[PDB]
Structures are given as C-alpha cells and as structure tokens.
C-alpha cells in the first residue's frame, strides 16, 4: 500500500516487526540456509504481526 | 545548484534527523495509545451484554 517493494522476498508468515516499511509491513534479515537446503541469508518482507 | 549547496553547508542532514526523529516519533505515538496489550482479541460472539 506504501508503494513497490523490490529486492525482498515478501512472505506471507506473520513475524513480528524488524525494520518498519510502512502500510503495516515490515522487513526482517533471516537465514534461509536452514530452510531451503541450502539457501542463502536474506531479505524477507511480510506483514507485520500486531 | 547541488555543489553550491554542498560547499555551503551540511544542514539537511540535520533537518532530516530532525524529521527521522518526528517520524519514529509519530509511530512510537501510535504503538504508545493503540498498542497497549500485545495480544489481539476477536469480538465476543456472544452478545449477552
Ligand atoms: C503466499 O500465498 C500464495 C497464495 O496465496 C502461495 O502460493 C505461496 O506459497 C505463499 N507463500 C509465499 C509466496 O512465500
């Protein structure tokens, strides 16, 4: 709703806020290595859990 | 205009801290009023009031 968000890998989980986008979502630096065989630590957007 | 600005002065630095610091304020106003409790609860179906 704020406007495009490039270069995070939005998320539809629900954590809570790390760094305030704005329109209620928030972005978080999170390891994806343990989660996806082996992936790469990034960037993940979502909506922020209230 | 942007290097007469440049050699003139560092004041917007400061203008935007200023700013940063009304903006993150303005949202810690609202995390301070509506806020409160953490947990969210649903509307209490039963209307028995
Ligand atoms: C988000 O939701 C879509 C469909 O609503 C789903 O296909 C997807 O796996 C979900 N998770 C994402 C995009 O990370």
Request: contains cysteine; hydrophobic residues 35%; charged residues 15%.
């Given at each position: 709703?704020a406007?495009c968000?490039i270069?995070?890998?939005?998320?539809?989980?629900?954590?809570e806020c790390?760094?305030?986008?704005?329109?209620?979502?928030?972005?978080?630096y999170?390891?994806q290595?343990?989660?996806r065989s082996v992936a790469?630590?990034?960037?993940?957007?979502?909506?922020?859990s209230? | 205009?942007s290097?007469?600005?440049?050699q003139?002065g560092?004041?917007?630095?400061?203008?935007?801290?200023?700013?940063?610091?009304?903006?993150?304020?303005?949202?810690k106003?609202t995390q301070?009023?509506?806020?409160?409790?953490?947990?969210i609860?649903?509307?209490?179906q039963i209307?028995?009031?």
């Open positions: 709703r406007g968000l270069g995070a890998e939005h998320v539809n989980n629900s954590y790390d760094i305030p986008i704005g329109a209620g979502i928030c972005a978080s999170q390891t290595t343990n989660s790469s630590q990034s960037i993940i957007a979502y909506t922020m209230l | 205009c290097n007469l600005l440049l003139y560092s004041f917007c630095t400061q203008l935007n801290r200023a700013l940063t610091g009304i903006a993150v304020e303005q949202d106003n301070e009023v509506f806020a409160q409790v953490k947990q609860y649903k509307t209490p209307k028995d009031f």
